[PDB]
């Protein structure tokens, strides 16, 4: 709280890491299609 | 050399040192109370002891590096005063770093 | 609450000064070995019969 | 954790897991590779020890 003030290669790191969030979110859906596979590749 | 690296990888994920700093002078105050009760209980400075410490290097930081992305990422999406904020996320994120 | 020391920043501080203090102080009288005493404790019987 | 909330405010809990995994992502991302950064020096050692 102290030290906190309010307010290129950063910029590229946070869109990568915002396309990675969407994938995974697209992935994460696609993953839940398949369950039951899941479970037998956990097994 | 561990601490270093430990520190490195979180600026370049908070790309703000003022961000990082807050979880890396965590570190050295638990190592320090770490020796304290090694002290108290009569423990000698072993390869043993101190790989352990190297092993707890990246642990010691994470209940730090939670609330830092926590307050960071509230702050920079709601957009409150900084305090009201950082309470707010201590708030929401307790329970998962006690846990 | 857990907001004590969010609300006046000294206390927390001064906690730490003294933990870290405590630690420098305590780290000069700790001793230094390769390994503890893991092994097993050994005692030896001598008798002589000439 | 978060994925037990969602579903205590009434989120169906399919949409609650994705939720919640989405957002945190980054913080388990953060303490994993940090713990793996304090790890990298002990697997590329050239020293005795």
């Not at chain 3, 501080?13 to 001793?31: E, M, N």
């Not at chain 4, 897991?17 to 793996?36: C, H, Y």
């Not at chain 4, 950064?37 to 697997?43: A, K, S, W």
Request: hydrophobic letters at 60%; glycine letters at 4%.
């Amino acid at each position: 709280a102290t030290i906190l003030k309010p307010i290129g290669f950063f910029a590229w790191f946070d869109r990568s890491f915002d396309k990675v969030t969407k994938k995974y979110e697209l992935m994460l859906l696609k993953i839940i299609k398949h369950t039951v596979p899941m479970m037998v590749i956990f097994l | 050399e561990a601490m270093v690296l430990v520190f490195i990888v979180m600026y370049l994920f908070l790309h703000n040192v003022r961000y990082t700093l807050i979880p890396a002078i965590v570190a050295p105050i638990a190592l320090l109370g770490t020796f304290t009760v090694m002290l108290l209980a009569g423990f000698s400075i072993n390869v043993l002891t101190m790989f352990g410490m190297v092993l707890a290097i990246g642990i010691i930081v994470d209940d730090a590096i939670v609330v830092v992305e926590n307050v960071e990422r509230i702050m920079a999406t709601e957009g409150l005063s900084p305090k009201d904020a950082t309470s707010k996320a201590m708030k929401e994120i307790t329970s998962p770093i006690i846990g | 609450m857990s907001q004590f020391f969010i609300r006046r920043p000294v206390f927390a501080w001064v906690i730490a000064i003294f933990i870290i203090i405590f630690g420098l102080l305590s780290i000069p009288k700790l001793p230094i070995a390769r390994f503890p005493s893991v092994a097993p404790p050994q005692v030896n019987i001598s008798a002589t019969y000439p | 954790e978060f994925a037990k909330m969602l579903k205590e405010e009434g989120m169906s809990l399919i949409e609650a897991t994705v939720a919640a995994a989405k957002l945190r992502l980054r913080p388990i991302l953060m303490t994993s590779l940090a713990f793996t950064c304090g790890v990298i020096p002990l697997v590329i050692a050239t020293g005795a020890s």
